[PDB]
Design an enzyme around this catalytic site. Structure first.
Site, PDB file in Angstrom:
ATOM      1  N   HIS A   1      59.705  46.658  73.576  1.00 29.74           N
ATOM      2  CA  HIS A   1      58.775  46.155  72.571  1.00 29.74           C
ATOM      3  C   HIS A   1      57.929  47.236  71.904  1.00 29.74           C
ATOM      4  CE1 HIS A   1      55.710  46.026  75.912  1.00 29.74           C
ATOM      5  NE2 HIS A   1      54.916  46.355  74.907  1.00 29.74           N
TER       6      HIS A   1
ATOM      7  N   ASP B   1      63.470  44.171  78.132  1.00 31.38           N
ATOM      8  CA  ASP B   1      62.361  44.863  77.481  1.00 31.38           C
ATOM      9  C   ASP B   1      62.498  46.316  77.895  1.00 31.38           C
ATOM     10  OD1 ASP B   1      60.088  45.657  76.175  1.00 31.38           O
ATOM     11  OD2 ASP B   1      58.689  44.462  77.360  1.00 31.38           O
TER      12      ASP B   1
ATOM     13  N   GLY C   1      48.218  49.017  75.673  1.00 34.06           N
ATOM     14  CA  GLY C   1      48.325  50.457  75.543  1.00 34.06           C
ATOM     15  C   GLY C   1      49.060  51.068  76.723  1.00 34.06           C
TER      16      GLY C   1
ATOM     17  N   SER D   1      51.568  49.713  78.041  1.00 34.98           N
ATOM     18  CA  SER D   1      52.960  49.301  77.882  1.00 34.98           C
ATOM     19  C   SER D   1      53.954  50.449  77.822  1.00 34.98           C
ATOM     20  CB  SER D   1      53.099  48.421  76.638  1.00 34.98           C
ATOM     21  OG  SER D   1      52.091  47.430  76.625  1.00 34.98           O
TER      22      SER D   1
ATOM     23  N   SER E   1      55.879  46.090  80.963  1.00 39.42           N
ATOM     24  CA  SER E   1      56.384  45.176  79.934  1.00 39.42           C
ATOM     25  C   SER E   1      55.322  44.265  79.312  1.00 39.42           C
ATOM     26  CB  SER E   1      57.503  44.309  80.514  1.00 39.42           C
ATOM     27  OG  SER E   1      57.959  43.354  79.565  1.00 39.42           O
TER      28      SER E   1
HETATM   29  S1  AES Z   1      51.914  46.475  77.764  1.00 38.17           S
HETATM   30  O1  AES Z   1      53.223  46.227  78.354  1.00 38.17           O
HETATM   31  O2  AES Z   1      51.073  47.094  78.767  1.00 38.17           O
HETATM   32  C1  AES Z   1      51.167  44.940  77.432  1.00 38.17           C
HETATM   33  C2  AES Z   1      49.794  44.781  77.664  1.00 38.17           C
HETATM   34  C3  AES Z   1      49.090  43.771  76.997  1.00 38.17           C
HETATM   35  C4  AES Z   1      49.762  42.927  76.104  1.00 38.17           C
HETATM   36  C5  AES Z   1      49.056  41.744  75.508  1.00 38.17           C
HETATM   37  C6  AES Z   1      49.409  40.483  76.307  1.00 38.17           C
HETATM   38  N1  AES Z   1      48.726  39.284  75.716  1.00 38.17           N
HETATM   39  C7  AES Z   1      51.137  43.079  75.876  1.00 38.17           C
HETATM   40  C8  AES Z   1      51.840  44.088  76.544  1.00 38.17           C
END
Ligand code: AES
Lengths: 198, 150
Positions: free
Chosen positions: A36, A63, A141, A143, A159
């Protein structure tokens, strides 16, 4: 730049994510991260400088993604942890209940345990199956960032999670957290990548 | 070193408890396949669990009458449903969603011998409708409220 797990990188000068792990595909350098985080060909930058482009990705459903880097990048078998780092020694998957930690540009190095496997997450863009759930906290962040055991066994890449209005789920007890990550081995296997170890 | 601080801060694992925990983490890994092989069709999953006194242990569940295991260090827990049964319900949920506002996620959870369906706080009804349309046995599924949103 020094490719280390958990550090911030930008995508198309528009969004932010965290590096998963340094990997190689033959002579090609790269790093794995969340699908993503970027679409194929999207440009990845670290410190404002272009370091590579998204070579492949799958999201939703799975993902995962990997960024093919320029030969100038420096791959290191590490995951950031404060001023220090954790050495990546392998990719042996830990059992449910095992202690695991994750690294990312927002919440840094956080630990918890694996609480469930083969989880299907109902993301806005569509379901993603096969995720592992842990209770270490995380936030927007983080992610794509690294999930690793205490002994340096790489587990997967961040993810998603049940974050609150403040952008993270560190404000709620671990017992109520749903921090999900994409397992590492299937990513390495699908793309024919090898984890850089030390 | 710097990991010990995080482990103690986030998991409540103090230095002197590290060795025994590590031994249990390794045991869970090395014996996983052997445990599955031994419990056969009645296997209901295995996990590392922490005792009230701070120590850790490896637990293995079975839907059978078995009360012990040939492999050492394994606590046997008798449950109602087998992993295969829970996996079937899980597949039904996946299928139902493949054809869900309020539903966060779902997964087989051996520790509670059920398939868990997490929903946003105040969306239990969404979780109920989801389970119903999926055709999943309600006795094998449990809805759990989850703060925040995915
Ligand atoms: S990312 O994979 O750290 C992550 C953190 C926060 C979000 C928003 C969820 N509502 C999405 C992905």
């Amino acid at each position: 730049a020094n490719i280390v797990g958990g550090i911030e990188y930008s995508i198309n000068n528009a969004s932010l994510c965290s590096v998963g792990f340094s990997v190689t595909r033959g002579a090609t350098k790269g790093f794995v991260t969340a699908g993503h985080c970027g679409t194929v060909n999207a440009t990845a930058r670290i410190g404002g400088a272009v370091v590579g482009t998204f070579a492949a990705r799958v999201f939703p459903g799975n993902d995962r993604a990997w960024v093919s880097l320029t030969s100038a990048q420096t791959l290191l078998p590490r995951v950031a942890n404060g001023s220090s780092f954790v050495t990546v020694r392998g990719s042996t998957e830990a059992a449910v209940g095992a202690a695991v930690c994750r690294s990312g540009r927002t919440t840094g190095y956080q630990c918890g345990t694996i609480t469930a496997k083969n989880v299907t997450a109902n993301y806005a863009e569509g379901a993603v199956r096969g995720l592992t759930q842990g209770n270490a906290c995380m936030g927007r962040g983080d992610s794509g960032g690294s999930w690793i055991t205490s002994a340096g066994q790489a587990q997967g890449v961040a993810s998603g999670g049940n974050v609150q209005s403040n952008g993270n789920n560190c404000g709620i007890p671990a017992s109520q957290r749903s921090s999900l990550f994409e397992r590492l081995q299937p990513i390495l296997s699908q793309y024919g990548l090898s984890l850089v170890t030390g | 070193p710097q990991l010990k601080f995080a482990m103690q801060r986030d998991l409540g694992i103090f230095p002197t408890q590290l060795p025994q925990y590590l031994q249990t983490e390794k045991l869970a890994r090395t014996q996983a396949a052997a445990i599955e092989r031994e419990f056969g069709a009645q296997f209901a999953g295995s996990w590392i669990e922490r005792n009230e006194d701070g120590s850790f242990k490896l637990v293995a569940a079975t839907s059978g009458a078995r009360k012990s295991s040939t492999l050492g260090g394994v606590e046997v827990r008798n449950v109602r449903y087998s992993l295969k049964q829970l996996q079937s319900a899980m597949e039904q949920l996946d299928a139902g969603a493949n054809a869900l506002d309020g539903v966060q996620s779902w997964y087989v959870d051996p520790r509670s011998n059920a398939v868990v369906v997490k929903v946003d706080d105040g969306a239990t009804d969404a979780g109920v409708d989801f389970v119903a349309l999926s055709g999943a046995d309600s006795a094998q599924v449990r809805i759990e409220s989850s703060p925040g949103k995915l």
